[PDB]
């Protein structure tokens, strides 16, 4: 068995599918957005998690495909349901390093794009600090373009450099010790003024306990993500999901 041919086969068969991750305003209400979760439905192996396969499909260059057929599944996934989906509905998908290279990713906006009413669904793109350290002011129309296509760019697992971004994510690392360090308290209050001066949204991921979300909300954290909210879920859980939303 080789890793290579077992990815490049699992594609080939539509082995990595969309898990969707539900966002909430952070005063609470109706889902307005999610963040989509690669997994790989291993016919062998079961439901296997990002952790075990992502660092390779990086290093083999395999992640762009995957990424796009991915992609692809999510317009044909929720491009039907529109009807269902708060306008403005926030779809975000994380990104390499080496998707940031050249201009093919502007397509594939382009393409999930078309599947939706124009306007109706806010594209967003998360990349880490760390992932832009390749490159950092140079080929970089691929932002201007994308920014003209109404797409947005978020920073993932910010706080674990000179953007052209719209959104910061505070990583679950921070959000873990509300209430139990002053010090992380701190700096995490710090991150949410910076996000403000900037004129940037601010997600909170790994939201677990009421605690959490009620320090985060009196602060005016834009959105929350996390266990409290909705684990990852499938395409089909989120749409019933969805449906009772609509009621009231
Ligand atoms: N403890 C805790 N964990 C929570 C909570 N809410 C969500 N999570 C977990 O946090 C991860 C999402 O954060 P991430 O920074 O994108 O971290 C992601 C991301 O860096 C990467 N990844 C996932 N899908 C993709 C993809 O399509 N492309 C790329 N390049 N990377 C991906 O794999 C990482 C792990 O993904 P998952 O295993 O799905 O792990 C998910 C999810 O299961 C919570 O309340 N508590
Ligand atoms: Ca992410
Ligand atoms: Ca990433
Ligand atoms: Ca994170």
Known sequence: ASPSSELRRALEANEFIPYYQPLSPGQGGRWIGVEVLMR??????????????????????????????????????????????????????????????????????????????????????????????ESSEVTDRLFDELHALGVKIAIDDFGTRKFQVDCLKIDQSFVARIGIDTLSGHILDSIVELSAKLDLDIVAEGVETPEQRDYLAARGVDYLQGYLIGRPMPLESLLSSLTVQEGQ
Not at 50 to 57: E, K
Not at 97 to 121: K, M, N, Q, S, Y
Request: charged share 25%; proline share 7%; hydrophobic share 45%.
């Open 40 to 133: 790989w439905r291993h016919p062998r192996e079961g439901l296997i998690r990002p952790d075990l396969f992502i660092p390779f499909a990086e290093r083999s260059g395999l992640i762009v495909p995957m990424t796009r057929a991915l992609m692809r599944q999510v317009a044909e996934d929720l491009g039907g349901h529109a009807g269902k989906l708060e306008p403005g509905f926030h779809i975000g998908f994380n990104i390499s390093a080496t998707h940031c290279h050249e201009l093919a990713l502007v397509d594939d906006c382009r393409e999930l794009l078309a599947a939706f009413p124009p306007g109706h669904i806010t594209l967003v793109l998360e990349l880490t600090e760390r992932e832009l350290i």
